[PDB]
Write a protein that binds this DNA or RNA. Structure first.
Ligand SMILES: Nc1nc2c(ncn2[C@H]2C[C@H](O)[C@@H](COP(=O)(O)OP(=O)(O)OP(=O)(O)O)O2)c(=O)[nH]1
Ligand SMILES: [Ca+2]
Ligand SMILES: [Ca+2]
Ligand SMILES: [Ca+2]
Length: 341
DNA sequence: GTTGGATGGTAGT
DNA sequence: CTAACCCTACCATCCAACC
């Protein structure tokens, strides 16, 4: 079984360069403007020229403006990138209808049947990169392995505008040699628990007591890592299905005032309900980000679909429930829908 | 025991 | 207002209602 993974290069920023070809070769930074003050908010992403200077996805815009004053700062246009993204997903579809869209800019193809070996798979990767550059002038990075996880890694090892195979040989070695903190799914907190344990490599997990590992990182992660290690990982490529859709906004200033918070919450509901598109949710959750940025939420599942009217009425109740129970001012407010019929 | 709801932690993009 | 967006997946834990 062979799996090809495609992840587009500095996406949002690359789209901006294609739409505006003068930008290429200069620093470009795509920003989410929060509205709270001149340049309040965060960097969605930035091109490699910009990354050279410490400007990356996630930092605060005014810090980007600090460390790289003279770059090009562009406002995020999520719908433009999504149209490009849709056109590209359809290209990848030409190459295999067995596709798994994992986000705005990346996908896993199962190519077990288009190709007999890694060499052909490699050439298909080459055939892919070309088509996308032909049709959407977008460069991408391709990872090929026997499974999602190791394909992802191959891609990570090749960014930007690269293509890499990890063959059965490589897989065997990376199990023995690749730092554990580099396994997709193993973030900071986890990685820390694993070193206190003395597990630095995927292989280290084999020679430990399952119940001792579990009783540190959780069941799900423990099984997962051991599966990886035993080279028994075989999660198929499956058509992704949204489990929840929502929207959360940033207020002009922090409040506790229901009158002041309400138009933000309602804005979220409109956008959220519009993004649903013939989907009927049985569960609503109001989500609040506090002064000190701790995230907090109150929900309700009904036994039936929620109509836009129920959602309205319900989200106010729930926002009150937060305010009743947490006495910190609120900074961002939004809503989330789930359990679609 | 079962599942499944509320809330929150962790991870990733 | 003085930095920290935006969105979704999956999982753990704390309960409760129950086959
Ligand atoms: N608003 C916002 N958007 C983000 C954030 N992280 C990623 N994105 C968006 C912008 C990216 O172009 C798009 C794909 O992200 P990626 O993680 O794949 O990296 P990107 O393509 O930007 O650079 P690439 O070479 O992978 O590193 O997702 C974030 O923290 N906030
Ligand atoms: Ca990506
Ligand atoms: Ca990318
Ligand atoms: Ca990590």
């Amino acid at each position: 079984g062979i799996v090809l993974f495609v992840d587009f290069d500095y996406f949002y920023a690359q789209v901006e360069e294609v739409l505006n070809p003068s930008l290429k070769g200069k620093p470009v930074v795509v920003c989410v403007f929060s509205g709270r003050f001149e340049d309040s908010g965060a960097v969605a992403t930035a091109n490699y020229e910009a990354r050279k200077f410490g400007v990356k996805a996630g930092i605060p815009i005014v810090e980007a403006k600090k460390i790289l004053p003279n770059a090009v700062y562009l406002p995020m246009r999520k719908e433009v990138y999504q149209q490009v993204s849709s056109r590209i997903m359809n290209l990848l579809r030409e190459y295999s209808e067995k596709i798994e869209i994992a986000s705005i800019d990346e996908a896993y193809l199962d190519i077990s049947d288009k190709v007999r070996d890694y060499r052909e798979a490699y050439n298909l990767g080459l055939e892919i990169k070309n088509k996308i550059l032909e049709k959407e002038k977008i460069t991408v990075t391709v990872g090929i392995s026997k499974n999602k996880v190791f394909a992802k890694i191959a891609a990570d090892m090749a960014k930007p505008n690269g293509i890499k195979v990890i063959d059965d040989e490589e897989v065997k070695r990376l199990i023995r040699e690749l730092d554990i903190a580099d396994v997709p799914g193993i973030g900071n907190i986890t990685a820390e628990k694993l070193k206190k344990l003395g597990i630095n490599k995927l292989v280290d997990t084999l020679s430990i007591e399952f119940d001792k590992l579990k009783g540190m990182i959780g069941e799900a992660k423990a099984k997962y890592l051991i599966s990886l290690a035993r080279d028994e990982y075989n999660e198929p490529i499956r058509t992704r299905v949204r489990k929840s859709i929502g929207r959360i906004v940033t207020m002009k200033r922090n409040s506790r005032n229901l009158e002041e918070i309400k138009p933000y919450l309602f804005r979220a509901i409109e956008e959220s309900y519009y993004k649903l598109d013939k989907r009927i949710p049985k569960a609503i959750h109001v989500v609040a980000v506090t002064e000190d940025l701790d995230i907090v939420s109150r929900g309700r599942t009904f036994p039936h679909g929620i109509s836009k009217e129920t959602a309205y009425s319900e989200s106010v109740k729930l926002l009150q429930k937060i305010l009743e129970e947490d006495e910190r001012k609120i900074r961002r407010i939004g809503v989330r829908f789930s359990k679609f019929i």
